[PDB]
Amino acid sequence: STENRVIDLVVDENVPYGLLMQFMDVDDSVYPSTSKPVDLTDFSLRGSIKSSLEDGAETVASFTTAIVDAAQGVASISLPVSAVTTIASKASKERDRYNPRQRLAGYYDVIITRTAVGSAASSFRIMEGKVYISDGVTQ
């Protein structure tokens, strides 16, 4: 995977979450800013959130994945408001003294996969890190 590229997602309470990626391969040896959007046809990403980083952990939520634009390279990872509410319910209560809005919910990963006839399994991990819930008051 990308151990050096761990990013912590922040989901707002009482708000549906949305995050969009762009798979866009580059080759700047010919000239700088030579980037071609990767075709995402017949790609299906999927992921999950679990409370602890070990086997036997209780699953918290599964992202409602989608492919917004095929052949344009714009994939999306997201989950509805009810799932965010479940995350907020399951999240820990060890609030920081100087970041009293963020609580830890669990760990997440998502895997992209190729399901092409004439091909084989091409699962690959593209995201890794933790899911932090930001508290909300306006409901």
Binding site: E3, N4, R5, V6, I7, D8, D96, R97, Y98, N99, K130
Partner: protein, 298 residues
């Protein structure tokens, strides 16, 4: 009356209309001054003794802050403001300087009883921290153009530094092979800007303050101190020969500065225990230098 104690102060940096109150501040130093034009017009008629001094400019201020690492990683904005490109929580050193002028911001030094000193047109010119056997701390150095005294101010109630990160021993690697006998890894990053003095005859009888500046260069540097250790007779891995290109990383549990290709120069000191000293700079065609900021659990 009201005295002004350094311990009873609060430093808020104003950028983009939001106040970045930088708590976990170990110590800061600043000064303000004015520039004078003092000439003595001694003539054959009157060999005078009294000079002709007029205050016409504000000498740029040199503010230095020492900031502890924090769990919310607000301190990485200093790399962000100094010119590094951002992707996630990692800061890249761009191949070319993006803009001619640096990123300008204002800074407040709050104190009790509505007392404040307002530094304006500031830019981050130096950031260096030493990964050592003491708690790491990055000394930032900013230069101001105009300083002023104001009554009301901006106070960063929400944007603040969290708890200081626990100490973790540094370690420097080549790819994945550890380099033995580390002493002190010191990293240095700079944005060597220069003030463009445009004091003209339209500013006569007025106080001039520097306003615009341009970036001469950006750079990333590191000085590594080791003990002279050899494992073999005529060793090839550990010696004093220069290394034109070699992948290096100065890694910690919370930060990792990566040189995709490095130019290493070695220097041996015949001290009580022999010490070798590296001089690591990125090569000509090296990929952008990485600076990762891990809050907790990487």
């Amino acid at each position: 009356m009201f005295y002004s104690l350094m311990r009873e102060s609060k430093i808020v940096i104003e950028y983009d209309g939001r106040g970045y109150h930088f708590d976990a501040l170990s110590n800061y130093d600043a000064s303000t001054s004015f520039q004078e034009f003092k000439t003595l017009r001694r003539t054959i008629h009157n060999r005078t003794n009294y000079a002709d001094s007029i205050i016409n400019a504000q000498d740029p201020s040199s503010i230095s802050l020492a900031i502890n690492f924090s769990t919310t990683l607000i301190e990485s904005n200093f790399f962000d403001w100094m010119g590094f490109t951002r992707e996630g929580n990692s800061l890249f050193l761009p191949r070319n300087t993006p803009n001619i002028e640096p990123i300008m911001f204002n800074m407040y030094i709050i104190n009790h009883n509505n007392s404040c000193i307002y530094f304006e047109n500031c830019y981050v010119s130096t950031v260096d921290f030493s990964l050592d056997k003491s708690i790491p701390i990055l000394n930032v150095g900013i230069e101001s153009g105009k300083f002023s005294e104001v009554s009301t101010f901006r106070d960063g109630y929400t944007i603040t530094q969290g708890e200081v990160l626990p100490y973790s021993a540094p370690a420097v690697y080549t790819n994945s092979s550890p380099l033995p006998a580390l002493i002190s890894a010191s990293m240095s990053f700079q944005q060597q800007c220069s003030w463009r003095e445009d004091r003209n005859i339209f500013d006569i009888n007025k106080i001039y303050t520097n306003k615009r500046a341009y970036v001469n260069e950006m750079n990333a540097s590191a000085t590594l101190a080791f003990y002279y250790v050899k494992r073999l007779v005529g060793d090839k891995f550990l010696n004093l020969d220069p290394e034109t290109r070699t992948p290096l990383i100065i890694k910690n549990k919370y930060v990792s500065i990566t040189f995709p290709l490095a130019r290493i120069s070695k220097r041996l000191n015949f001290s009580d225990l022999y010490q070798v000293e590296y001089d690591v700079i990125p090569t000509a065609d090296s990929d952008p230098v990485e600076i990762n900021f891990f809050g907790e659990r990487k």
